[model samples]
Target: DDFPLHRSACEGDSELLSRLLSERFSVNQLDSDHWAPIHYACWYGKVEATRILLEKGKCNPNLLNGQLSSPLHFAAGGGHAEIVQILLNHPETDRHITDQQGRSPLNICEENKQNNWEEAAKLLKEAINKPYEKVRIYRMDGSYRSVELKHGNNTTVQQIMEGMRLSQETQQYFTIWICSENLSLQLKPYHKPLQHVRDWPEILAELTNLDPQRETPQLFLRRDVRLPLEVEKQIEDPLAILILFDEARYNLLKGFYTAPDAKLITLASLLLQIVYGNYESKKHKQGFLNEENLKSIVPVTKLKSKAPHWTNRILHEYKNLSTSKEMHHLQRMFLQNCWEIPTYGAAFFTGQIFTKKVIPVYVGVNIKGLHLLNMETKALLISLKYGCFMWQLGDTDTCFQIHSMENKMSFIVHTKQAGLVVKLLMKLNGQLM
Candidate 1:
């Protein structure tokens, strides 16, 4: 009955260890390193010592030993089944309680990675057989954000899988992103990776290669003059390899948002993709001087009235059946004479510039003339019609009209001022009728 439990407990004497604890020895005693007899017993899975310690009802349940361990925590670290049972049955022992490291029994099992899987899985499975639950902390907005991810990106592969799984129990929705510069939508299921019904270049070549018949259902190769020497060079060394009226028109109309007005009618014509692109071909038979941008309020800029009833708001009276915004916007765009040939998409126009192409300059006026320059040479395979679209518009088989080729220049000829135009043509060409 010495009741001197400390000495024997410190010396690992199980016999003395048992004797002292039962004799009302303070199981709560701690050595310099802060280990109690219960801590020592649990570390080695000493069943008799553990049983004696647990029977001491006044033992501190909140005790923490050296290495910041509790009795149950030490038992788990030693894989002491009996010691764990003794601690668990002590009424206050919570298998779910986290130790100083914030690790519950299950967390301690999962936290170790080296030499872990088998032992850990077995322990986890045994743990699952027990009745238990968890509590979750969430943000005020109710969004469960996982900051453990890179850049705090909540959308992860695992999360996406969970979302799909959740969708089976709920409704799903979609989002779309369109890129205007490329005239395309974000990469999605339907878009071809490298191919489409047609490519832009192929479509353009198709347009320039074919000939359009004025009235016949059939189309023909576009026939027109050899590019003026200067114009040919410009066409040859095009900033881009192509200049399809249809594609260019389609793009122009769509780019300027012409659908609200022409309802893609003009846009359709502009996108010269149809195997039969005749409707838009030979379609632009006239031109107009749009006063939309000009500050007519300026003294000399007012749609100068030369005739009795000329209206300032009205453009010079040239007209056509083609109500194309693509065609119209081209007329209104006087910002810069410099135009870069578009390449891949609507936005990626190539970087070549030309200044001397004999542009069949058409106008809303009643004048007819042609500026001839020696067309240059380059990689260009074909050139656009300059003189008379009569190639595509009038006689299906014949094309070579001087008047309609350019509106103001061709207007007299297009509108039967041809006799006068013929004289000018003869005065200039001195070659053909």
Candidate 2:
């Protein structure tokens, strides 16, 4: 055979391998059997040859051999303990790769009847077991805290809250949430965050920074459980009111709380008063209400075409507002405007409903009931009150059906958040009664 590198490695001749490698020979050259030089070195228990290839030649330890076995697999199977340790030391080595028979390197070691298998088996086992990984919990102020969670443990959201040592009185009001630029989901108390992260690969993309195009998904703790209307009206705590205002403002800006154009103008005017404080003639000029200021009140999609119209409407409403209004009063008025909207305090999920063909929709779950909206226009398609609809989850968690008792009709929605929708429906229905 003219495969000098493989011949040198198979003979355990480190000097010739080094000279050939220095002479610009390819370290990863494959023979007719699909075996790289490292595979031959690893299989023949050539520890020095393997070391030279790894340290000097920078050979890829993960290259599959003729049997689709990695170098580690070959080393572990042959009970080459020293070569196995060298392969494991290389950062590029993937211990999880399986051969043609679906046997991992550790599996190969255990199955082989070699006398020196224990050391290699021990190294592979240790590499396979990771103690823990760090997870981040983001906050409202764009800050995040880290927690070390044990691997393969079923850790619930409630346990995480407890670990944070939140007050027992206020803990029930908060929940962990996962959100992207377009959608938000509230995690159930019993839900495992780690398991959910594993299920959704998009979340992994955000965590790993692997995708350059997508906005990073956020995992944060927020106040989610809505109080009854009567109880909410009696809330006097400034902290609670501030939290409510922040949540409402966030929802409005994110297009979750859809409202009419007139209502939006009125809210924008009130928000302007709250932010800029009694607009002055010179201070609140056309240039003063620039695109940046407009974005805080209007969604980006509408701002491009309707900026001038929206700005003029907002300015007209701003001038009519009483000059003596306090910021908190304006905040209260803003909250009142949002409170009238059916979708306020709603957790929105982007999904599709089959109507003739598949129609893209957003399903909003709130204190009132479930609302189906046209995805592109935010126009209300259908509304189903909590008690008035009987719901059933499909065979998979990605689909669910709601049967309207009044019309005796059913609607099927296909969404990844189907389970969360059902959970919210059940929880809110119980609360409403």
Which structure among the candidates has the greatest TM-score?
A: 2
lDDT of 1 at 402: 34
TM-score of each: 0.25, 0.59
The CA lDDT of each predicted structure is 0.34, 0.74
User: lDDT by residue for model 1 over 232-271, one digit each (tens)?
Assistant: 2233212111222322333332232111223222222222
Which is the leading candidate under lDDT?
Answer: 2
| Cand. 1 Cα-lDDT | 0.34
lDDT of 2 at 184: 54
Error of 2 at 219 (Å): 2.0
Backbone clashes (count) for model 1: 24
